[PDB]
């Protein structure tokens, strides 16, 4: 029976040695896939180690029974058990460390992939945001302006969510304690900055297009007014006072708009203003 204990203890020792040096691995995953495979394999190996714990406890129980019974070799036996307990504890640690490492390498691969797809997506949205296309007439600019508004909105909505998700994820890693938290943080900072830049680029593009719309809206309105002056000329008391108000507005728009332009373009604005004024005077 003590003779039997020794064999059992030697057997447990050999099993521990085998798991520690030969079953568990130091291999380092090259990629997410490789990591998933290694992790899956590692977790089963670790369940095996935990499961062996039953064997060890039972052996202690026997070493304790053999000691308390006053066996001649009770001191020798209780020592071997201490050595086994120790070696087993060493193996559980090594397994847990490995698990901690694989989870870190894995998660990081996921985050890196998700950050990259997102940064690329942002880069793509920026090109659309950089378009110079100003549009040839009023209907064309109306089109671009309306199309870009839809784009600004779809981009704002989808992007903010994706940004939020990468942020929440990055935070979860750091909160659970990750070996690479300093590097992950630089990624968050880089990503958040790009997002802000995209939202600003989107916004200036929109301001550009609003200004372009205003310029074309003015010329369009001038044309309408000339036709309206002409229509009345060829032609009631109230209608003219009202067309008169419409003219006064056009006059205000022309001055406001003038401050923004210079040279050829600014003059075109003035020419059209005077043309309208002259036509209006002819009527009165």
């Amino acid at each position: 029976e003590a003779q039997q204990y020794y064999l059992d203890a030697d057997e447990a020792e050999a099993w521990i040695g085998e798991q520690e040096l030969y079953v568990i691995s130091d291999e380092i995953p090259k990629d997410e896939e490789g990591a998933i495979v290694m992790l899956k394999r590692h977790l089963r190996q670790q369940r095996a180690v935990e499961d062996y714990g039953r064997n060890i406890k039972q052996l202690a129980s026997r070493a304790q029974g053999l000691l308390s019974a006053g066996h001649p070799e009770g001191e020798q036996i209780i020592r071997l058990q201490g050595q086994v307990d120790k070696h087993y504890a060493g193996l559980k640690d090594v397994a847990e460390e490995r698990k901690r490492k694989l989870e870190n390498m894995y998660h990081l691969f996921q985050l890196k992939r998700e950050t990259d797809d997102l940064e690329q997506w942002i880069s793509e949205k920026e090109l659309v945001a950089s378009s110079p296309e100003m549009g040839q007439d009023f209907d064309h600019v109306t089109l671009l302006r309306d199309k870009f508004r839809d784009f600004a909105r779809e981009t704002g909505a989808i992007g903010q969510e994706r940004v939020d998700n990468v942020n929440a994820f990055i935070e979860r890693l750091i909160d659970a304690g990750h070996s690479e938290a300093a590097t992950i943080a630089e990624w968050k900072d880089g990503l958040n900055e790009m997002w802000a830049d995209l939202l600003e680029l989107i916004d200036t593009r929109m301001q550009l297009l609003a200004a372009s719309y205003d310029l074309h809206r003015y010329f369009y309105t001038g044309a309408e007014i000339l036709g309206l002056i002409d229509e009345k000329h060829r032609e009631f008391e109230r209608d003219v006072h009202l067309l008169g108000v419409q003219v006064q507005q056009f006059q205000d728009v022309a001055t406001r708009l003038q401050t923004a332009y210079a040279g050829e373009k600014a003059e075109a604005i003035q020419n059209k203003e005077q043309e309208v004024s002259a036509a209006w005077q002819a009527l009165l």
């Binding site: 950089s130 600003e200 200036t204 550009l208 401050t259 923004a260 332009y261 210079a262 373009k265």
Partner: protein, 151 residues
């Protein structure tokens, strides 16, 4: 406090703006220098991004990131001022590339009062800029890239 991340609007009323991320990085568009509302972008790009980074002689080195001002190709009616911060025997040279494939050297003083076209802005002395390590690039147009180097 109106600074920019990467762009801002400006019209013929002129306008002056500083990078909100980088105060030293300054863009001055004086009154009457562009014909219409223009959307100015100014982005600092890492060298590693170009297909043709500026060719480097033996003791030569970059002193700033690549600077992309937009829109590429834009012509102004007179000159505009862009101040770029840079990092600390040898000499500062601004280089520009019209389309990203060829780099050439770019290069005022008494012009300052003139080119501002009446703008109430307090430009620094060239000596104050050297202390703070900023370069003043005066240009009437934007090439794709400008960079600051030392030879």
């Amino acid at each position: 406090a109106t600074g920019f991340l990467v762009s801002f609007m400006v019209d013929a009323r002129g306008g002056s703006m500083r990078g909100s991320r980088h105060n030293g990085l300054r863009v001055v568009i004086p009154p009457r220098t562009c014909a219409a509302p223009t959307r100015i972008t100014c982005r600092l790009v890492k060298p590693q991004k170009l297909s043709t980074p500026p060719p480097l002689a033996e003791e030569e080195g970059l002193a700033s990131r690549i600077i992309a001002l937009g829109p590429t190709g834009a012509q102004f009616l007179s000159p505009v001022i862009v101040e770029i911060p840079h990092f600390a025997d040898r000499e500062l040279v601004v280089l520009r590339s019209e389309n990203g494939s060829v780099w050439k050297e770019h290069r005022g003083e008494s012009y300052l009062d003139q080119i501002l076209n009446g703008m109430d802005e307090e430009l620094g002395s060239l000596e104050e800029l050297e202390k703070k390590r900023v370069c003043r690039i005066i240009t009437t147009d934007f090439p794709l890239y400008f960079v600051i180097m030392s030879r």
